[PDB]
Amino acid sequence: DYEDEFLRYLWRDYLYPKQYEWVLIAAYVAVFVVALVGNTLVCLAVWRNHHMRTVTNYFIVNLSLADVLVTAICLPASLLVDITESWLFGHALCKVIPYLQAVSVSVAVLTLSFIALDRWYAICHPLLFKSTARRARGSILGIWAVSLAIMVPQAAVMECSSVLPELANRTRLFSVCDERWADDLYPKIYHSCFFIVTYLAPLGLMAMAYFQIFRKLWGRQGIDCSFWNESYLTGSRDERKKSLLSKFGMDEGVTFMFIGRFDRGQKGVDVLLKAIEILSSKKEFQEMRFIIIGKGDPELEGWARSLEEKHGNVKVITEMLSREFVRELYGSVDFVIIPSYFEPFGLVALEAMCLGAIPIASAVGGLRDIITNETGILVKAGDPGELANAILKALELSRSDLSKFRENCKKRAMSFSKQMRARRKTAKMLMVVLLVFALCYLPISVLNILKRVFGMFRQASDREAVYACFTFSHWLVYANSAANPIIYNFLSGKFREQFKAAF
Numbered sequence: 001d002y003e004d005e006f007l008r009y010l011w012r013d014y015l016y017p018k019q020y021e022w023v024l025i026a027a028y029v030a031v032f033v034v035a036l037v038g039n040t041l042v043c044l045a046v047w048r049n050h051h052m053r054t055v056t057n058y059f060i061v062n063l064s065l066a067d068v069l070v071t072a073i074c075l076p077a078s079l080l081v082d083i084t085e086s087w088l089f090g091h092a093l094c095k096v097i098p099y100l101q102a103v104s105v106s107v108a109v110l111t112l113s114f115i116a117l118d119r120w121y122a123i124c125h126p127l128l129f130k131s132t133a134r135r136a137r138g139s140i141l142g143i144w145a146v147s148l149a150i151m152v153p154q155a156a157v158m159e160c161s162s163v164l165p166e167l168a169n170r171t172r173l174f175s176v177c178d179e180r181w182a183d184d185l186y187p188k189i190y191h192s193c194f195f196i197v198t199y200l201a202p203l204g205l206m207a208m209a210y211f212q213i214f215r216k217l218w219g220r221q222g223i224d225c226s227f228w229n230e231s232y233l234t235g236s237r238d239e240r241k242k243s244l245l246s247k248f249g250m251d252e253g254v255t256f257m258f259i260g261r262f263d264r265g266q267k268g269v270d271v272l273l274k275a276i277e278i279l280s281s282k283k284e285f286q287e288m289r290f291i292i293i294g295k296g297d298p299e300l301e302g303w304a305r306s307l308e309e310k311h312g313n314v315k316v317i318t319e320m321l322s323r324e325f326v327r328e329l330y331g332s333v334d335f336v337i338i339p340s341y342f343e344p345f346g347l348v349a350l351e352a353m354c355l356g357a358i359p360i361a362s363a364v365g366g367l368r369d370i371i372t373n374e375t376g377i378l379v380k381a382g383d384p385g386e387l388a389n390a391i392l393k394a395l396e397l398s399r400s401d402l403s404k405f406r407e408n409c410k411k412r413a414m415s416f417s418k419q420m421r422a423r424r425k426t427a428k429m430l431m432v433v434l435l436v437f438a439l440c441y442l443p444i445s446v447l448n449i450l451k452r453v454f455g456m457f458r459q460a461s462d463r464e465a466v467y468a469c470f471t472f473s474h475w476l477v478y479a480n481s482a483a484n485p486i487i488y489n490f491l492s493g494k495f496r497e498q499f500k501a502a503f
């Protein structure tokens, strides 16, 4: 009957110090300083500069503030508890510190969620993208408010235990801090809801969001603007056009080029051929030159070759070409025709535009994104008529200087490529941050959801090994705070510049 209290009476002074305590402390100290100077360096880096004041970076700042809170208040307490197995602070801090722990976790996760949502709208729904600084400094307050509000049961149930309840002998060596609930279903509910709210739902939703983002950004790395450069072409452009046409046995005229595999339902060379057939009449056809390059279906090649034989102003090339020569072609011709059906990337547009060629493309896929007004002509796909009309307009535009137009094409292509690259980078960084977060908060979450709902680690000598895993999980939790600034330092150039500048 009195076995528990007597065994506690015989073993109350039994201390069995862990061999590897100094490795814990060290780690805890490391993580401590690294989390401080790290996260502060983030805050400063955003606060001092004007170019660093992005919504994303404001969120990052909120995250760093939360992690700073954790590092300053919760880390030393956790170290002391994990190393002495006792609560050395007051009865009030017994409620305050774990509360702030929960709140901090909440704020962090929610902040990451707002980042992910922001990028999801930015990438996957450009037209609906709205991210003012007022939305940030206004939703962050919502995050802190909700976090502070929903974590009050944590503060409520925290109590400072000492010895077995209903025991007349209040004698003790040390006290502890743990959760004291009225019922037994209450812990299960609060902790299941805690696990779902602060880990399951947001990391799930964010996984989905970054899945859509990465699926949208896949295969879009841009082009090599070091190769596709007009600087490697000689002479003037009209001289290169005259030379090119003369080489094919043609007189000077407004030159249109096509290049791509011959498809009945993709690259739309058939639409082009039909368009040329449409243009076979009219008084404007002899002012035009057509260069059809590619290889594919025998029928389409026969069609193109027959048109080449029919008209003296149409040249068909089934010959395998070099990248340098294609580059020359883009920097000689006046217009490039991209009559694609579903073109998802549209690299020909970018390259041609980089080399001064003005694109005439079907307004589909990536071509819509790349080509705007003043930077090209857009056409309804699968419609030879509207294509022919666009070609006629291109002819009517060639009666002007067209220099600033080509320059606009260059600027457009370059800026587009750079934007997509930067996008790829930032998305990469945020994904890494999220991943590291998930990994860091995983073990303590499974251990917590096991301990507080599905049974517990409480029976017999199943504790002095569970203790180690628990302390490690805790340290990991605090280690995340030190992890984020390093990630920023290795995956964000501006943060690199700022970190380096701070010393």
Ligand SMILES: Cc1nc(C(=O)N2CCC[C@H]2Cc2nnc(-c3ccccc3)o2)c(-c2ccccc2F)s1
Pocket: 074, 075, 077, 078, 079, 081, 097, 098, 099, 101, 102, 105, 154, 194, 441, 444, 445, 448, 474, 477
């Ligand atoms: C040291 C830690 N304790 C926990 C933990 O079990 N809980 C329950 C819900 C939130 C957190 C709150 C808490 N309980 N004790 C402390 C504490 C804090 C400091 C010193 C001593 C005790 O903080 C941690 C935790 C668990 C899951 C998810 C996130 C967490 F932060 S970390």
